[PDB]
């Protein structure tokens, strides 16, 4: 299967520089243009620029000509965006993305985006709490106080879905900060565990808070 | 530079009906156009290229027309699923560049939030902070005022809002609201209560617990 | 596609001196690669071809090195008319990829801007329309700031401002501005000025006329 | 009196650029090179250039070459030195100088120094607290917490009050600077008497003056 | 770079006695050699310049020898107030290039510190921190030991620690130590403990309250 897999998140001081890495699988690697795309917190998508593996043709955008520099590593698979002399307007989320038509269909494949932040303040690893208290029962998961972005949050390692609401993270005061609450029949909290699954990326971090009731 | 620009930062229709988004080239691009389609916390997905051919996967609700200059991403039978921004695109000239983007809303009758609240867990308190939550689930407009009072008095600082966005199953809205205290402060009083203004009600809905 | 990379987009040097602008490849061309010279509303002109041999008529000055990927062009003896855009291109593989090309920029004292304003003329004036233009010439550095006023009063819409390159002659630059406005609106007033701020300037230089 | 006046502290953030200014008066402003030295924290000193006011000519250690940039503005009689690019390793205190041999002594003029900070960080003003005791001496005190970036002066009775005091260098913690003073005085002084320990914070442009009060 | 050594960095002597530098230069700097003095906190001072002539206002005490790459400062009747660093520099060629510096210090008898401790002010208390300060004044020789103890548990965290130089007026050093708690975490304890080990007595200095 064809897969662009990309790291979470990249925490970078003003002034040094960072490079972004999209390693290609299940595909030929030098078959295909490599696209780049920037997305401000918040903002529209801008286009960084392309480079097709098989002999590093690359094709910039004026805007990124000196921050961005596209290559590749064919031993890998692996296509590479460095970003240097950064600044705040460089925190972003880079994706790396193809397009491939077979003759049959047009098929778009997209990585998960890099996180890219500028900032002097450390990694801090999230404080995960949780929210304990009729037919159903509301419980919730307080993500509190980590840098930088992303969290993502999950209920029973995704077996929990429906009736789940993840509230996007507010910076205040230097650190992110979200929640998450989760409606289930009162059959089945407290009766069977409930667990709120936390992982940041930026810290290696992977907790898995239990909704005792207590 | 060519400049595509969206017409409209929002659109809306009600589930069922029809949407659609125009976007404006600056020079002529001819048919060279793509469309994407963006869900909140995920990669852009590519829905239409060549103006009017959609990718595979792409349903035929989603089609595009236009060629020159003024070009329309229409989206039929429109679901809560496919709440999310759209984007035009043109590649016919370099540098690529992007529209702004349409964020689709939809319309649908009034909806009263589901209000609960949490006091700060043992956990937290060991920490020396303490947190309040109140969440408020499935409302709708997303129009809400949200106050935190202590024994009675008003707390407006110290408070973490966030919304999400419409919800992808039921068009709804919610709300979680966190009062943060230093664990001194949390034990220096007793009654906690978080009241929401909504339209669905003239009077406050009051979720409230004494630490007592 | 073969990718020829001019890392540098402008070179600083005065005249005399020698300057160096460099070329990488992103495969091994050997040295199929040429450089060409590009002055402004110019055609280009072939100035180097392999790598290191000179088209007839290119003066000694102008010489190229280089084998497998990185190239170099070298310059010596700058002159004031050298001021162009220099670009490399490899002919080793198909398609032929230019580079991005590198303008050649002079370094030189400092001058102040002649300053000289114009009204409307008669001919125009029978055409409905009415320009004031400001000449700003022989200056240096490039960055320079021009205010129209209009009864002591100042006017921004309706402004159209030129630059042009350096010289080729004394490496100065030199701007145009042109406040453009209806004949009547020409006539409802009478005292036109355009105010140059430059480096130079200890106080803005003032050019007036009075309807 | 022959004086250069220098400003206390420049707060810079990374990859921006600062001037530096150097006012001279009381002589005649183009009869001197004026040289500049940096000094980071806990080091030894260095040479950045000098130049001559007169006609701008300059010498520069190639160590600061595409990093300062001297000129002067002979109108004000005030000589400049701009620093590019500026980086962790720029945050230093930053002196003009002249010598002057009037041709009976040489003396030498140095400027008070420019504290330049490249830091993220934003300003924070200090939070000067009292120190008073719960002897033919008593000893009282001043703690200065809390503030970004440096520095800070600290006198006692606007400088009346000098024997006896120990200024204590400051403290970087938590991203903040922390320092105390203390000034030993006879019994028959305090609490009869005034004490007041005087704070200046130029990066915040803070002036504050706390009374040593017996509770 | 010319290279000026200063193969001491640090000097030591007594209250009216004598000391002397050296600094080696890399080459020969014929005598444009320069002696500065800086005191903590000031701009540094020319003492010397041209190997042996002092600035004026310079004391006879301050003498500078040397030609060639052997250049000496020696200060003779040593007092509390030449406490300083000392830099040589050499200004015979470009770029101009100082020694690592020398600081004076100062050896006399051993003095007990003057412990004097300080709770929380009432106005740092609605603030919502607590500091508590501990002054240990004129001791000698400047090693010592400070403990904090809360209700009979020592504290090792949040404590600021702080040295003087040596005292300008009778060579002594002097400490600050803060410790700074939560007003809470303040409000739940009652006794505050500081105590002082210095060489002068295996018996520490303790300083308490009760709040
Ligand atoms: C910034 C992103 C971007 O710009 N892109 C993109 C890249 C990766 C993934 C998604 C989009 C464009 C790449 C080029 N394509 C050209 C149109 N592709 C075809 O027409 C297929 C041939 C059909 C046929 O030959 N039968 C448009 C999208
Ligand atoms: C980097 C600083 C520096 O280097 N300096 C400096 C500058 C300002 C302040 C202090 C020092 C000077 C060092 C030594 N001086 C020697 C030249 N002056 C004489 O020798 C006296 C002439 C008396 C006579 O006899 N005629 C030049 C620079």
């Known amino acids: 299967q064809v897969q662009l897999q990309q790291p979470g998140a990249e925490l970078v001081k003003p002034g040094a520089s960072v490079k972004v890495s999209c390693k290609a699988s299940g595909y030929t690697f030098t078959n295909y243009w490599m696209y780049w795309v920037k997305q401000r917190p918040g903002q529209g998508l801008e286009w960084?620029?392309?480079?097709?593996?098989?002999?590093?043709?690359?094709?910039?955008?004026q805007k990124f000509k000196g921050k961005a520099t596209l290559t590749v590593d064919k031993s890998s698979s692996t296509a590479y965006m460095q970003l240097s002399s950064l600044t705040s307007e460089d925190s972003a989320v880079?994706?790396?993305?193809?397009?491939?038509?077979?003759?049959?269909?047009?098929?778009?494949?997209?990585?998960?985006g890099t996180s890219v932040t500028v900032s002097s303040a450390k990694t801090t690893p999230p404080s995960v709490y949780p929210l304990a208290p009729n037919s159903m029962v509301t419980l919730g998961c307080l993500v509190k106080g980590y840098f930088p972005e992303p969290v993502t949050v999950t209920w029973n390692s995704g077996s929990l879905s429906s009736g789940v609401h993840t509230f996007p993270a507010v910076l205040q005061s230097d650190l992110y900060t979200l929640s998450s609450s989760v409606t289930v029949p009162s059959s089945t909290w407290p009766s069977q565990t409930v667990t709120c699954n936390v992982a940041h990326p930026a810290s290696s971090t992977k907790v898995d808070k239990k909704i005792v009731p207590r | 530079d060519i400049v595509m620009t969206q017409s409209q930062k929002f659109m809306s229709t009600s589930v069922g009906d029809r949407v659609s988004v125009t976007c404006?080239?600056?020079?002529?691009?001819?048919?060279?156009?793509?469309?994407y389609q963006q869900k909140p916390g995920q990669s852009p997905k590519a829905?239409?290229?060549?103006?009017?051919?959609?990718?595979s996967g792409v349903p035929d609700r989603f089609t595009g027309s236009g060629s020159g200059t003024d070009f329309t991403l229409t989206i039929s039978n429109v679901q809560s699923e496919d709440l999310a921004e759209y984007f035009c695109q043109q590649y016919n000239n370099y540098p690529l560049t992007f529209g702004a983007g349409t964020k689709l809303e939809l319309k649908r009758a009034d909806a009263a939030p589901t209000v609960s609240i949490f006091p700060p867990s043992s956990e937290q308190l060991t920490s020396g902070g303490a947190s309040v939550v109140c969440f408020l689930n499935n409302f709708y407009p997303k129009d809400i005022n949200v106050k935190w009072k202590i024994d009675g008095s008003e707390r407006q600082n110290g408070v973490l809002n966030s919304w999400t966005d419409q919800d992808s199953k039921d068009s709804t809205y919610s709300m979680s609201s966190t009062l943060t205290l230093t664990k001194d402060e949390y034990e220096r009083h007793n009654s906690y209560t978080c009241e929401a203004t909504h339209k669905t009600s003239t009077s406050p809905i009051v979720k409230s617990f004494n630490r007592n | 596609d073969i990718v020829m990379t001019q890392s540098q987009k402008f070179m600083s040097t005065s005249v005399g001196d020698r300057v160096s602008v460099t070329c990488?490849?992103?495969?091994?061309?050997?040295?199929?690669?040429?450089?060409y010279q590009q002055k402004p509303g110019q055609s280009p002109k072939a100035?180097?071809?392999?790598?290191?041999?000179?088209?007839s008529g290119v003066p000694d000055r102008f010489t190229g090195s280089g084998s497998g990927t990185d190239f170099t062009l070298t310059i010596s003896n700058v002159q004031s008319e050298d001021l162009a855009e220099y670009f490399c291109q490899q002919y080793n593989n198909y398609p032929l990829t230019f580079g991005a090309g590198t303008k050649l920029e002079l370094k030189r004292a400092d001058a102040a801007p002649t300053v000289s304003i114009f009204p409307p003329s008669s001919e125009q004036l029978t055409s409905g329309g009415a320009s004031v233009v400001c000449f700003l010439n022989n200056f240096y550095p490039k960055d320079i700031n021009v205010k129209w006023k209009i009864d002591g009063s100042e006017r921004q819409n309706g402004v159209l401002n030129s630059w042009t390159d350096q010289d080729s002659k004394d490496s100065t630059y030199s701007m145009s501005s042109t406040l453009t406005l209806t004949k009547d609106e020409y006539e409802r007033h009478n005292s036109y000025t355009c105010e140059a701020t430059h480096k130079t300037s200890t106080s803005p230089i003032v050019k007036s006329f009075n309807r | 009196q022959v004086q250069l006046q220098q400003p206390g502290a420049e707060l810079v953030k990374p990859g921006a650029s600062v001037k530096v200014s150097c006012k001279a008066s009381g002589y005649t402003f183009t009869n001197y090179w004026m040289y500049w030295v940096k000094q980071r924290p806990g080091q030894g000193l260095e040479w950045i250039g000098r130049?001559?006011?007169?006609?701008?000519?300059?010498n520069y250690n190639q160590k600061f070459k595409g990093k300062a940039t001297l000129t002067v503005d002979k109108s004000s009689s005030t000589a400049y030195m701009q620093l590019s690019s500026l980086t962790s390793e720029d945050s230093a205190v930053y002196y003009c100088?002249?010598?002057?041999?009037?041709?009976?002594?040489?003396?030498?003029?140095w400027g008070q120094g420019t504290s330049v900070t490249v830091s993220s960080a934003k300003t924070t003003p200090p939070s000067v607290y009292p120190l008073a005791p719960g002897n033919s001496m008593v000893t009282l005190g001043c703690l200065v917490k809390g503030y970004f970036p440096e520095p800070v002066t600290v006198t006692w009775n606007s400088g009346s009050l000098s024997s006896g005091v120990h200024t204590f260098p400051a403290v970087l913690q938590s991203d903040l600077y922390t320092l105390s003073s203390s000034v030993t005085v006879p019994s028959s002084t305090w609490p009869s008497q005034t004490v007041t320990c005087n704070v200046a914070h130029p990066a915040s442009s803070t002036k504050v003056d706390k009374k040593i009060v017996p509770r | 770079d010319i290279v000026m050594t200063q193969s001491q960095k640090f000097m030591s002597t007594s209250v009216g006695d004598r000391v002397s530098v050296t600094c080696k230069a890399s080459?020969?700097?014929?005598?444009?050699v320069a002696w500065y003095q800086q005191k903590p906190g000031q701009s540094p001072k020319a003492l010397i310049y041209?190997?042996?002539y002092r600035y004026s206002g310079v004391p006879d005490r301050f003498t500078g020898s040397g030609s060639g790459t052997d250049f000496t400062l020696t200060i003779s009747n040593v007092q509390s107030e030449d406490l300083a660093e000392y830099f040589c520099q050499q200004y015979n060629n470009y770029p101009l290039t100082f020694g690592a510096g020398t600081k004076l210090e100062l050896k006399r008898a051993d003095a007990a510190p003057t412990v004097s401790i300080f709770p929380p002010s009432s106005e740092q208390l609605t603030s919502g921190g607590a500091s508590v300060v501990c002054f240990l004044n004129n001791f000698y020789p400047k090693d010592i030991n400070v403990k904090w103890k809360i209700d009979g548990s020592e504290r090792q965290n949040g404590v600021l620690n702080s040295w003087t130089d040596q005292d300008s007026k009778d060579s002594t050093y002097s400490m600050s130590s803060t410790l700074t708690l939560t007003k809470d975490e303040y409000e739940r304890h009652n006794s505050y403990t500081c105590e002082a080990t210095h060489k002068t007595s295996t018996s520490p200095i303790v300083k308490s309250f009760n709040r």
């Open positions: 041209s190997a042996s």
């Open positions: 100088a002249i010598e002057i041999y009037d041709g009976y002594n040489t003396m030498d003029y």
């Open positions: 130049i001559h006011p007169s006609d701008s000519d300059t």
């Open positions: 080459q020969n700097v014929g005598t444009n």
